[PDB]
């Protein structure tokens, strides 16, 4: 589970949550508020 993913040649390491709906998530995980990096599971 070490390897992770979410303009040209951009890089974006910001750790802020998916505000996946109208909720201001304030870093709290829940419905419409999800951690921004997935991982592979090799």
């Amino acid at each position: 589970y070490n390897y992770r993913y979410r303009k040209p040649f951009e890089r974006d390491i910001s750790t802020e949550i998916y505000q996946a709906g109208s909720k201001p998530c304030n870093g709290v995980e829940g419905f419409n508020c999800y951690f921004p990096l997935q991982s592979y599971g090799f």
Partner: protein, 64 residues
């Protein structure tokens, strides 16, 4: 944090632009004999550096 690099009379002019994650700098240094405003005249800035920063910019600030 992935990148690091090293290298009124004095009017110094610069251009800063970001394209495809490169940061491009052009410059020109000249004497002048004026105070309130940029002198009415012409010369071209020439390229200094072309740095592979890969980073987003929308705001900037100057250090005195």
């Amino acid at each position: 944090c992935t990148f690091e690099y090293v290298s009124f009379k004095n009017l110094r002019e610069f251009v800063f632009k970001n394209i495809d994650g490169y940061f491009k700098i052009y410059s020109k240094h000249t004497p002048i004999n004026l105070v309130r405003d940029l002198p009415q005249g012409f010369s071209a800035l020439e390229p200094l550096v072309d740095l592979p920063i890969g980073i987003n910019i929308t705001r900037f600030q100057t250090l005195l």
